[PDB]
Symmetry: D3
Subunit: 224 residues, 6 copies
């Protein structure tokens, strides 16, 4: 029950479902989520994935209480992942949003990076993909302040493709997924795969640097 | 008559002129267009190029009926190319727009990538330059859906620098070209050349990957 | 008196102060400014730097009258620099703005690149960072025309994070700086340092090309 | 008969067999060779490929008589290709050797790049992979002179891993292939695939530049 | 006693000392070794580090019996590390050798990569640094065969700078370290740091790809 | 007389001629040398350049007595430069050798990097091109020790293509130049230009980092 899954017309929707913990990613939820992404890749009945959260929060981040060296786990996918951001997407949860190919946001969406507030460095690509998707200045402002970015500003900045009234969110994400499903899937997958290969070639160096920064930070922190 | 050309105050305007075929790029029009770009480069009376289409469409893409391994042909230019997008710019036509240094759009402009609809992969840089100029999420949404991007959204996303009423389009493009012509041309050409060299260094890897993806797609398609 | 400095709650504000020369960067002001940035880095009482100009101009650029091979001098910093753009930021002054981590603009702000007007090529990163922060098309339009970009367009394009009424400018910059100061400084500095390392890895090739273009331009200019 | 093929203990040996035309790559031989590489990839009974030529020449290059825009065709492989160089490997034939993962040479081997002699630019990666595998100075010396590199110098320069007496060549290549076959194939293929991905990330930009240089050369040549 | 350490004339020598386990890197030895490298960096009495092993083996690799996700731990150093390779350097031990700035080898030295034999992928940079330091062909031959590279071939290939009689090894390494100590240390450290920054910029993308390949391999292996 | 020049059969030979100062590069000699390279590029009677020194030294480096911020000046050339290394090539002189496309060495040749001995960091590409042309380990050994590399080791390492008896040096360089002159010059220049563009794309980031390291070193040195 901590992860819901639904397959409908070649679209798999994955719903983070720990609303009482604001969909925080416990170890168990991590295992289920990343496992579900991998299963979607290998499932020949799935063309598109939608990820979302049970209201009122998209994902508050990692369950820090429960836990640190937090390795990246988002798998190589050849199928598009649409993030239907229904609420706050914070830190590790902002990183889940940044992994998506396409984002659509409820008016209730908001985005924040609290890594520096809580004294952790990112290891799931925030430091590469946030400046890539909202611009250097805004990424730096977000990360260093830990302030919320509204849905409207996220749209202005290019973080999301659309903002809809809250109750239309999953419909809006399904409509985009249906447009994709209706196109030539050999071409969709080949073109997405290529886009990922073009992007990876540009992000790889950064992701390594991010990893090494996090490691150095953790190690120096063990001067205590 | 399939390509019009006009030189006025050191600005060469090239107009795709097959309006009845929505300015689709036949083999002949390709030869004329790319040939004209090359001639503009070597013509010492030209500082700036404007490309546009006969109404109501900018360019509907390659003439697919007539035709496939479609090699890139846009030449090395040291002079700025302004695209005056007067209508729909689709697929290969969106790639012509993405090659321009600067875009200005009529309110009647719209942009779409139908490669995945029609079962072709891009070979004129769409997969590199679309995410570069409208952002990763929007590029992926466009490519995988094949949906139109409006003139206003194109402006919001950074695809175009300006949107004007339809009848002001060529005037708006000429005004920008005149501002350029009025500056130090040695500096204009040296600075543009450098901008192109800086950009090429970042896009080259991607363009190769795009080419290889297209090739692999074509070859696997010859499992039929 | 040509550079003012003030330290307050772990924020150092540096004010270019030659308003009668529109804060043009003379040799002396360059020495003071870059020297002050370096001192801020080594000063353990400073977490954040704000740069601004005495009204009504942010910085009109280098003092060209007084002067050319103008080497880059902005030092390696591990602390964030917020640019509080109070007025026109032109050419070398636009480059000072482009060096900042975060920009906030008065409604009175405007941005222009007159390098090509005045027959100089950039050597302080404009040709790398302008397309990075406002997009390729707009950067090329700005550089080749030398036209002003308004505060509102700068906000739309992602050049600045915010635009405020003129009298609120320094308050708005101090509020952002205070949010940063209130977070874990070990994390702030480590994350910023990493962001800079990720970015430098992407800009280095471009900056070298910019330098070489400027050099070739200067050398060919000595065919006179 | 223009391409021989043999499968033995999970090793596929492909022999260019037009010895009377010094194994020149006609259109037909190209189709057969590249087709055979692709079939080896998909053949689950093959772990390793050896390529070689019927004596006394490895490959004299493309059949130029018969033919120009010569697109690259070496496919994505996840299996190692050992080149057993039995004689001269010239121009397009040197490029076939440079595509191999591992080279072993007969004492009778020699290598030359005659592209500049014959007025053609490379399109099968010579200009990237020759400096990569023999060093910048030697690559430039080879390409600009068109002089032969001996087997012994090829060994000194790192172009080949070993040089054997002529009659031991295929035995030496089979021994290496047998060592590979005897290791964990899941690991062999995963590690090779990774090596290729690491290398491609470094060569892609170069290969694009090579392609564009060749194109510009061909186009300017059509000023005649 | 599992790691020996000695400081003499501003040179710290670290000796792996589990000769009965062929200096295999247990968890404890890993902690001691990487900890010692970090301490050398911060120790103001040390200019140069020499790493070596108790005879007859340099390092047989990780203690696999004892153990898998084996994260990289070699720290950022601004001081040169000379590897005095006294015997076999295998797999993880070859990676320790590949991390060194400079290698000198006993005649008794040999090098092998058994990752593919033992069904593991590298995570300490072998897949980036082996082709960098011995050339693509030889790296691929080594990795896929798991065959030993002799001291003499290692010298021919550029893996080591020198090969000495066994009893002269540490003297030869101390002589090089003494030459370094005798030069301007501010310059030595600044130049080394720069060399590392130049190299890291080229290896980072590869190291990320290596990490991701290893992860994917481990995850697929958990289909069992 | 400080620079000799000779044109013979489309080969321009430039001889550094301050043998009493071991061909040290004074300001005047720098101006003449770099000026001569530029003139060779524009001279339509020249296909190839040979650089050499009056015996017994190739180039001892910059005239340090006479002088520091030493900017790079080697121009963009589309014609090959062969370095005929007749004696010691030290520091700035090793950098002149590293700029050449092809090197041939007298038995009397030797190479050294004394930057760290004399407390200077390189600004003419040593820190990029030395590891590129002799391998990382040997470059680091050379730079940090300041020890001489013999002609024979230079040949083993790939720094030079050939080593000849002293009296045959210029004949050997002329023979290579004659082979180049005898090939299709349109192809020679196009292929060389491409090789330079492929290489520049890989070295640019490094050269920027080198420049920034040198600058930081000079600036910190002004803590005195
Ligand atoms: C350390 As994390 C998963 O919040 O980037
Ligand atoms: C194959 As096309 C010219 O539409 O990118
Ligand atoms: C030459 As400048 C400091 O205006 O980029
Ligand atoms: C044009 As060719 C196949 O000899 O590189
Ligand atoms: C997994 As390992 C430390 O042998 O590269
Ligand atoms: C500072 As220098 C010309 O010896 O690299
Ligand atoms: Ca299913
Ligand atoms: Ca943007
Ligand atoms: Ca004309
Ligand atoms: Ca203080
Ligand atoms: Ca079979
Ligand atoms: Ca080598
Ligand atoms: Ca001590
Ligand atoms: Ca002449």
């Amino acid at each position: 029950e901590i992860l819901l899954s639904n397959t409908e017309e070649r679209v798999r929707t994955l719903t983070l479902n720990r609303p009482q913990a604001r969909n925080a990613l416990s170890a168990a939820l991590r295992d289920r989520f990343f496992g579900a992404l991998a299963d979607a890749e290998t499932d020949d009945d799935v063309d598109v994935v939608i990820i979302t959260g049970a209201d009122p929060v998209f994902c508050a981040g990692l369950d820090l209480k429960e836990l640190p060296d937090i390795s990246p786990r988002w798998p190589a996918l050849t199928k598009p992942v649409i993030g239907a951001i229904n609420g706050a997407a914070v830190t590790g949860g902002l990183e889940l949003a940044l992994y998506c190919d396409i984002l659509i946001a409820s008016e209730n969406a908001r985005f924040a990076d609290t890594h520096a507030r809580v004294g952790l460095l990112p290891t799931w690509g925030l430091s590469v993909r946030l400046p890539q998707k909202v611009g250097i200045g805004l990424a730096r402002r977000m990360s260093l302040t830990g302030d919320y970015l509204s849905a409207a500003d996220a749209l202005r900045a290019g973080l999301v493709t659309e903002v809809v009234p809250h109750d239309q969110l999953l419909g809006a994400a399904r409509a985009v997924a249906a447009s994709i499903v209706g196109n030539n899937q050999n071409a969709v997958r080949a073109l997405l795969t290529s886009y990922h290969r073009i992007d990876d070639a540009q992000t790889s160096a950064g992701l390594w640097q991010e990893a090494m920064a996090a490691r150095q930070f953790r190690t120096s922190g063990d001067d205590i």
